[PDB]
């Protein structure tokens, strides 16, 4: 069977080749560089967030950009005020070495997880004077990598089990799971309307899934290896990608083809995180050479460079309206670019 | 206006002073990592020194993404038991790692018996500091010292010079007496002392 099945699998791939090559009737390079640029925009270190015993690994913006949560690797989970840098809560954790943290859009629960293979949610209503544990979403066979809150009842989790899963807070079980990845999935991104989501495993195979049906819808490829961070367009019709290929790519959800490639010759460091701007023209990405770089998605040029850290950036994020940018690195500091 | 600012500043200092209550406690716990719930943890104090050793064997076999999170551990514990070639190949990648530069690795051994896969040690020189007290026949002398020099040959051919390896023989006391040397190299290199 495999002698013929692998041949039909390859023959179908050529059908994908002529499909994507048929849509190559025009190039986006000419359309993007036939307009006016914007140039450098001034960005200053407005605030620095000290008070961490170890390095951070991920963040998540609050409900109305007033607050933001950061997860330290020692085990502390801190909630900060963007305006006055005041600590709100300092909830400890059952174990250390976390790798993800999610903030609910309603501001009622906060999730976090790491190598423990257990996703824990924490109620934010201070009854006992502090935060207490609410529910533990165990059951996975590998470490969790990314989590995103759809509502106060649903939450998706990216884990090393090579299979995404949708969870319900009412009982805490895998109501719907996705399959078809090669290698442990590392990051996922939720659409703003919470009607779609995409993920990427350690094969540069960005595959689209349905939030209401456990089946694959689309597949994206073109990165050399080890896709690391994905983020959707402000509207949801496209999404950029960040991989260890030291170059960012932009994919759309209509033509199903690689739109643009953001590469440079003077970089030998891989990408770790990527985030969009409110307008979508600016693409922010954290590098591994101790500095940050923002890319003009409509120009494929290094519009600006952000520095100040001496370690790798492991997380990014922008406000709910494109007001400020939060960049966290392994320096244990959380610098709010604005 | 001062009603909300003073209350917010009160919770702020009440949390900032809480981090001081466990900052020194955190630094006093020298984390450890052991290589071959999703993670196993053991705790033990040796002469007023805390040690939180973790076992990560319960995770995925692939070690491409979760090993990068361990840049904070002060010492990695490695063990051995053709799996012998793969164990050395893994040691090479850990040594030549881009980020794993400040985590000195410890190498242990175990009882074993392997001679047919490496026909080169048939001409290997005799050990210079052999320990024949347990009655070691020339088989185990050349064998143990050959795999010993193989790991040492890796740790001298490459590297920038900011981390070293420390083999041992056949416990916990042998690790504490070696972890002290790692801390000594840390507090001494900071002062530009060669």
């Amino acid at each position, epitope marked *: 069977e495999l002698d013929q099945l*692998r041949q039909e699998a390859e023959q179908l*791939k050529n059908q994908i080749r002529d499909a994507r090559k048929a849509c190559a009737d025009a190039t986006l390079s000419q359309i993007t560089n036939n307009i006016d640029p914007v140039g450098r925009i001034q960005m200053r270190t407005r605030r620095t967030l000290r008070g961490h015993l170890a390095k951070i690994y991920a963040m998540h913006w609050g409900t109305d950009s007033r607050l933001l949560v950061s997860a330290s690797q020692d085990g502390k989970l801190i909630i900060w005020d963007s305006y006055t840098t005041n600590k709100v809560h300092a909830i400890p954790l059952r174990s250390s070495w976390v790798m993800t943290c999610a903030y609910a859009p309603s501001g009622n629960y906060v999730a976090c997880g790491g190598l423990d293979n257990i996703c824990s949610i924490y109620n934010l209503k201070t009854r006992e004077g502090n935060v207490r544990v609410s529910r533990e979403l165990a059951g996975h066979t590998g470490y969790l990598s990314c989590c995103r809150f759809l509502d106060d009842n649903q939450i998706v989790t990216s884990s090393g089990d*090579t299979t995404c899963a949708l969870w319900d807070i009412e009982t805490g079980q895998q109501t719907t799971t996705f399959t078809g990845h*090669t*290698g442990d999935v590392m990051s996922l991104s939720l659409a703003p309307d919470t009607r779609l989501f995409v993920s990427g495993a*350690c*094969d*540069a195979s960005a595959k689209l899934w349905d939030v209401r049906e456990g089946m694959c819808r689309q597949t994206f*490829t073109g990165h*050399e*290896s*080890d896709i690391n961070a994905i983020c959707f367009f402000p509207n949801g019709n496209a999404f950029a990608t960040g991989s*260890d*290929d*030291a170059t960012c790519r932009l994919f759309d959800l209509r033509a199903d083809q690689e739109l643009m490639t953001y590469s440079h010759d003077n970089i*030998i460091c*891989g990408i770790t995180s990527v985030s969009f701007s409110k307008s979508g023209r600016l693409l922010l990405a954290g590098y591994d050479d101790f500095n940050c770089n923002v890319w003009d998605a409509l120009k494929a040029d290094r519009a600006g460079v952000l520095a100040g850290h001496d370690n790798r950036v492991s997380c990014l994020g922008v406000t709910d309206d494109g007001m400020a940018v939060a960049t966290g690195s392994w320096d244990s500091f959380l610098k709010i670019w604005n | 206006q001062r009603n909300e600012e003073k209350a917010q500043r009160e919770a702020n200092k009440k949390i900032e002073k809480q981090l001081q209550k466990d900052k020194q406690v955190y630094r006093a716990t020298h984390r450890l990592l052991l290589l071959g719930s999703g993670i196993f943890e053991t705790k033990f104090q040796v002469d007023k020194v805390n040690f939180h050793m973790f076992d990560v064997g319960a995770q995925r*076999d*692939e*070690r*491409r993404k979760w*090993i990068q999170c361990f840049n904070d551990v002060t010492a990695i514990i490695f063990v051995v038991a*053709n799996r012998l*070639q*793969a164990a050395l*190949k*893994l040691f090479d*990648s*850990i040594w*030549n*790692n*881009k980020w794993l530069r400040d985590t000195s690795v410890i190498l242990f051994l175990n009882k074993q018996d392997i001679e047919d*896969y*490496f*026909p*080169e040690f048939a001409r290997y020189t005799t050990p210079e500091d052999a320990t024949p007290e347990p009655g070691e026949d020339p088989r185990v002398t050349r064998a143990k010292y050959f795999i010993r020099d193989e790991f040492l040959r890796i740790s001298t051919a*490459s590297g920038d010079g900011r981390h070293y390896c420390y083999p041992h023989f056949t416990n916990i006391r042998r690790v504490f007496n070696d972890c002290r040397d790692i801390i000594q190299r840390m507090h001494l290199r900071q002062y530009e002392l060669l």
Partner: nanobody, 126 residues
């Protein structure tokens, strides 16, 4: 789409010679190292050979050292592994392998199960 296509193999008399080939496609060969993994019947995956991206520092294992040679060509992104004196223990399925993080010298567990950066591979017998 990245794909690893191998060639060469078949039943040959013991002590013969063969030149296995690995055709890289979909990725830049000038920035990545290469490795070779064999698999005995009823056994796991074992790394047997490798090569650097600069065309130097070639290394092998004690079981294939001397009688096994690996070659590369940046002008065509091809890979060639030639050997001689085929032993009965060498009868195994070979797979062309590559590891991520280009322009680096570190990559872990290339012989791990469920690995996608590995071609369909070929087999040889005595």
């Amino acid at each position: 789409q990245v794909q690893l296509q191998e060639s060469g193999g078949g039943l040959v008399q013991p002590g013969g010679s063969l030149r296995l080939s690995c055709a890289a496609s979909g990725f830049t060969f000038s920035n990545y190292k290469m490795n070779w993994v064999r698999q005995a019947p009823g056994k796991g995956l074992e790394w047997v050979s490798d090569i650097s991206q600069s065309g130097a520092s070639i290394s092998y294992t004690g079981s294939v050292k001397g009688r096994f040679t690996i070659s590369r060509d940046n002008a065509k992104n091809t890979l060639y592994l030639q050997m001689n004196s085929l032993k009965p223990e060498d009868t195994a399925v070979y797979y062309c392998a590559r590891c991520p993080a280009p322009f680096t010298r570190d990559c872990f567990d290339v012989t791990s199960t469920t690995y996608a950066y590995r071609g369909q591979g070929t087999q040889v017998t005595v």
